Amino acid sequence: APRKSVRWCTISPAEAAKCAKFQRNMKKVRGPSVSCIRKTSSFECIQAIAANKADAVTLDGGLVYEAGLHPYKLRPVAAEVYQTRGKPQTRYYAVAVVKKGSGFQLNQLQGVKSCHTGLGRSAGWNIPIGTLRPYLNWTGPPEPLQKAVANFFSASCVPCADGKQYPNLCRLCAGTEADKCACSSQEPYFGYSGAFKCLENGAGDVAFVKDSTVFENLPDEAERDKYELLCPDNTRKPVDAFKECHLARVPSHAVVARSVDGREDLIWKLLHRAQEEFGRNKSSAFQLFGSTPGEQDLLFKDSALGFVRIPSQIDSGLYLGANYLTATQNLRETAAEVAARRERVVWCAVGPEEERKCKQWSDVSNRKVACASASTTEECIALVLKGEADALNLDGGFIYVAGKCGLVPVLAENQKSQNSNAPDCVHRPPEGYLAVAVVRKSDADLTWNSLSGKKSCHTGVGRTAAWNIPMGLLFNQTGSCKFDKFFSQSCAPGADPQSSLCALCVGNNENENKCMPNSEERYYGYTGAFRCLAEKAGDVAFVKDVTVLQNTDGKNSEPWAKDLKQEDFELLCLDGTRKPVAEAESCHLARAPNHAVVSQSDRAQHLKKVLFLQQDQFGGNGPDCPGKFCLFKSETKNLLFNDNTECLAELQGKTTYEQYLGSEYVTSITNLRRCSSSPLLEACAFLRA
Ligand SMILES: [Fe+3]
Ligand SMILES: [Fe+3]
């Protein structure tokens, strides 16, 4: 029944003391118990935590990064909320503070004395240094970055810096004998406030700190006017102009915990109790976000408003985001490596077969396109959000998830439409496809209204033509969110492996990976869903009209298809009627949006360019199409793109997911969520908040 205490790791005597005061006032409040371990630096608590010596530590975005690295694999449990001068935020701006009448601009720091919050931190290191890499004249990774910074600045205070090999990096630090340059508040020049005093005491000429730092130390506007900010456009703006004059906007500090057995619940209960009891003016007996004057930011960021629980899927990579990850990873990669990445396009293939095809595409493109892979579509989208992949073609259904996560539709799939297949395609207005409900003509007893208790074959959960459209219509007539109970048994890759929805799925050939939402599952997709109906594993298949047309009448000669005939199949019309597969225009459940390639709005324009070239060479009229590679063909397996894609067209203005998918379908997808939500969709609610 009983649950133990959160062991909090401290990095200095001042911090231990604060922690003890915290543990003490916590038990006096008859609230969750705390304990305080004692290590000498945040890097040490990362280590202490991963080895189960401790359980929690607040870390700056930059150390979150290091903490998540492989040997430790820690994850951000709770994110601090801050000032903002307006709306509280889980982000902040890194800025460069200098005194007035110093003269230099951002591009003239060579030879300046500089004060840093500490080695590895967002505003004090990762951000300023990545901004000045271009003036560092640094080989790249082989040669230690500290050797570069040490040669650029005349002397500095970068706590946690190697003062033995690079003493210029520790030179400005005031600290006693071995206190000097310490990676804790022992070194008076450590932290936002430390880097500030190092500036204000004339030890350094520029301070790399947070946007609040100046105001936290100079409560009087008259004092602040003796200071300015170095804007990345080589101008100097007042300290209150950080919104315009910052080197970057980084994610807030965060309480990190082990990925496995980290006791996130214990940690959250503790922190939730702490804000309520000792946060913003709650108490007077103890203030959580307040520290002694000698040393600031003890255990937590002084004057933070509180914390927000970080959902569970979120790891450090997603917590930090592409923009931050890239810049951090960039300080550990060569110039040739960084530029290489920026010029290629990394596609995210879902499952084993798409990856092979992607491999072909990479080799055949001379590496303009490289690949990244994952077992499911959500995983790929996360990859796009971490910045490890650049794009992927998605179904209307996942364009929604993608759009809720801030990704935008770049170009759309235009199936070999029919009017005039001249160069109309790239500018032909995308026209969608009809989602249909297919059944064997044989089973004539079956009508839309007798689906209850029947068996179902679905392309996948989350997908338009299958899932979203039928389930949307059904939820309207049954009023029930019990989706696994309408159809007696079903195959809907992506569902709970032990629920009826995964009952008719077959996995790969040796029957493994049953229900996986990727090609391994033979019943996955439009093709698989139709097959499920054909091999009589299910009674109704939710696919698009064309799927039948492409696998009957021998067009698909795979054994199971080979002998099929479009006559053996009929469609279920919403009005209880039944029309041949050809009458779909008057017998469909809906008109869906074509799949679309998505990426960060950031990479969209490049992505477009590489894609117009790639498809001009291997597309529908690709000269090297039959010859060396066809981007839109894959033997009826619809890998990477649908096999009937004529080309990837323009959006006709529909550049946001809402515009693209349209109002109705976006709404319809929202009603369904009343029943079920996804972990990615939530991780993103937090991140894009
Ligand atoms: Fe920071
Ligand atoms: Fe679809």
What are the residues facing 440 on neighbouring strands? 569
Classified as helix, coil or strand, 559 is helix
Sign of CA dihedral 102, 327, 408, 468: negative
Sign of CA dihedral 111, 117, 120, 122: negative
- CA dist., res. 615 & res. 537, Å (int): 37
Q: Are 288 and 300 in contact (CB under 8 A)?
A: yes
> Could you count the other beta carbons within 10 Å of the beta carbon of residue 228?
22
Query: Nearest to residue 249, comparing CAs of 134, 85, 122?
Result: 122
Question: Read out DSSP for 160-171?
Answer: TS-TTT-GGGTT
Burial class for 4, CB neighbours closer than 10 Å (0-12, 13-18, 19+): exposed
Six-digit token string for 394:
């998605």
Residues 477-484: contacts with CB under 8 Å, at least 24 apart: 481/674, 481/675, 481/676, 483/675, 483/676
- CA dist., res. 97 & res. 88, Å (int): 23
Pick the CATH number of 1-91+251-339 from 3.40.50.300, 3.10.350.10, 3.20.20.70, 3.40.190.10: 3.40.190.10
∠ at Cα 282 (281, 286), nearest 5°?
A: 85
Question: Read out DSSP for 441-496?
Answer: SS--S--GGG-TT--EEES-TT-IIIIIHHHHHHHHHH----GGGTSSSEE-TTS-
Six-digit token string for 517:
């939402």
Residue 418 is classified by DSSP as: S
- 259 classed as catalytic: yes
- CA dist., res. 402 & res. 412, Å (int): 14
- CA dist., res. 33 & res. 26, Å (int): 7
Ligand in closest contact with the CA of 464:
2
Q: How far is the CA of 554 from the centre of ligand 2 (A)?
A: 23
Six-digit token string for 528:
């698989």
Classified as helix, coil or strand, 294 is coil
Q: What are the residue ranges of helices labelled H in 286-441? A: 316-320, 322-330, 335-343, 352-365, 377-386, 396-404
∠ at Cα 506 (503, 508), nearest 5°?
A: 150
Q: How far is the CA of 425 from the centre of ligand 1 (A)?
A: 49
Residue in this structure with the two tokens 């067009």, named with its chain if needed: 555
Q: Are 662 and 441 in contact (CB under 8 A)?
A: no
- CA dist., res. 368 & res. 362, Å (int): 7
Query: Nearest to residue 182, comparing CAs of 59, 300, 74, 44?
Result: 44
Annotated binding site: 60, 92, 117, 121, 123-124, 192, 253, 395, 430, 433, 459, 463, 465-466, 526, 594-595, 660
Q: How far is the CA of 402 from the centre of ligand 2 (A)?
A: 15
Question: Read out DSSP for 35-80?
Answer: EEEE-SSHHHHHHHHHTTS--BEEE-HHHHHHHHSTTT-EEEEEEE
Q: Are 544 and 433 in contact (CB under 8 A)?
A: yes
Active-site option among 102, 259, 375, 499? 259
Residue in this structure with the two tokens 């117009």, named with its chain if needed: 612
Q: Are 432 and 591 in contact (CB under 8 A)?
A: yes
Ligand in closest contact with the CA of 525:
2
Q: Which fold has domain 340-432+593-689?
A: D-Maltodextrin-Binding Protein; domain 2 (3.40.190)
Active-site option among 5, 53, 73, 282? 73
The total number of residues shown for the chain amounts to: 689
Q: How far is the CA of 184 from the centre of ligand 1 (A)?
A: 14
- CA dist., res. 677 & res. 313, Å (int): 13
What are the residues facing 306 on neighbouring strands? 81
Q: Are 594 and 432 in contact (CB under 8 A)?
A: yes
Q: What backbone phi and psi angles, to 5 degrees, belong to 63?
A: -80, -25
> Could you count the other beta carbons within 10 Å of the beta carbon of residue 98?
24
- CA dist., res. 423 & res. 426, Å (int): 7
Six-digit token string for 544:
């698009």
The contacts of residue 592 (CB under 8 Å, 6+ apart) are: 396, 432, 433, 434, 435, 464, 465, 469, 544, 665
Q: Kindly list the distances between the CA atom of residue 136 and the CA atoms of 126, 166, 441, in Å, as whole numbers in the listed order.
A: 14, 16, 73
Ligand in closest contact with the CA of 61:
1
- CA dist., res. 298 & res. 677, Å (int): 38
Ligand in closest contact with the CA of 122:
1
What is the four-CA torsion angle of 167, 168, 169, 170, rounded to 10 degrees? 60
Q: How far is the CA of 395 from the centre of ligand 2 (A)?
A: 5
What is the chain's Cα-based Rg? 29
Q: How far is the CA of 597 from the centre of ligand 2 (A)?
A: 13
Six-digit token string for 267:
């940690």
∠ at Cα 159 (154, 165), nearest 5°?
A: 60
Six-digit token string for 555:
């067009």
Q: How far is the CA of 561 from the centre of ligand 2 (A)?
A: 21
CATH of domain 433-592: 3.40.190.10
Q: How far is the CA of 253 from the centre of ligand 1 (A)?
A: 6
Residue type, 556: N
Six-digit token string for 143:
């040669």
Ligand in closest contact with the CA of 118:
1
What are the residues facing 393 on neighbouring strands? 597
Ligand in closest contact with the CA of 212:
1
Q: How far is the CA of 169 from the centre of ligand 1 (A)?
A: 19
- CA dist., res. 46 & res. 390, Å (int): 31
Enter the resolution in angstroms.
2.6
Query: Nearest to residue 416, comparing CAs of 525, 531, 550?
Result: 550
∠ at Cα 29 (28, 32), nearest 5°?
A: 100
Q: Element (H or E) spanning 315, and its range?
A: none
Q: Provide CATH 3.40.190.10 ranges for the chain.
A: 1-91+251-339, 92-250, 340-432+593-689, 433-592
Burial class for 310, CB neighbours closer than 10 Å (0-12, 13-18, 19+): buried
Q: Are 81 and 90 in contact (CB under 8 A)?
A: yes
Annotated binding site for Fe(3+): 60, 92, 192, 253, 395, 433, 526, 595
Burial class for 313, CB neighbours closer than 10 Å (0-12, 13-18, 19+): middle
Query: Nearest to residue 660, comparing CAs of 440, 432, 470?
Result: 432
Ligand in closest contact with the CA of 248:
1
How is the beta sheet containing 57-59 ordered, strand by strand?
57-59, 254-258, 74-81, 306-309
- CA 134, distance to chain mean position in Å, is 28
Six-digit token string for 112:
């300046």
- CA dist., res. 634 & res. 618, Å (int): 13
Q: How far is the CA of 321 from the centre of ligand 2 (A)?
A: 29
Query: Nearest to residue 255, comparing CAs of 49, 540, 488?
Result: 49
Pick the CATH number of 92-250 from 3.40.50.720, 3.40.190.10, 1.10.10.10, 3.40.1500.10: 3.40.190.10
What is the four-CA torsion angle of 195, 159, 333, 233, rounded to 10 degrees? 10
Q: Are 245 and 230 in contact (CB under 8 A)?
A: yes
Q: Are 523 and 541 in contact (CB under 8 A)?
A: no
∠ at Cα 526 (520, 532), nearest 5°?
A: 70
Q: What backbone phi and psi angles, to 5 degrees, belong to 517?
A: -85, 65
Exposure string over 398-430, b if 16+ CB within 10 A, otherwise e: bbbbbbbbebbbbbbbbbebeeeeeeebbebeb
- CA dist., res. 253 & res. 300, Å (int): 9
> Could you count the other beta carbons within 10 Å of the beta carbon of residue 652?
13
Q: How far is the CA of 242 from the centre of ligand 1 (A)?
A: 15
- CA dist., res. 434 & res. 349, Å (int): 26
Secondary structure string (H, E, C) spanning 170-239 = CCCCCCCCCCCCCCCCCCCCCHHHHHHHHHHCCCCCEEEEECCHHHHHCCCHHHHCCEEEEECCCEEEEH
The contacts of residue 115 (CB under 8 Å, 6+ apart) are: 156, 157, 172, 189, 194, 195, 196, 198, 199, 203, 204, 206, 207, 208
Q: How far is the CA of 503 from the centre of ligand 1 (A)?
A: 50
Q: What is the largest CA-CA distance in the chain?
A: 91
Annotated binding site for D-glucose: 430, 594, 660
Query: Nearest to residue 588, comparing CAs of 537, 650, 543?
Result: 543
Classified as helix, coil or strand, 596 is strand
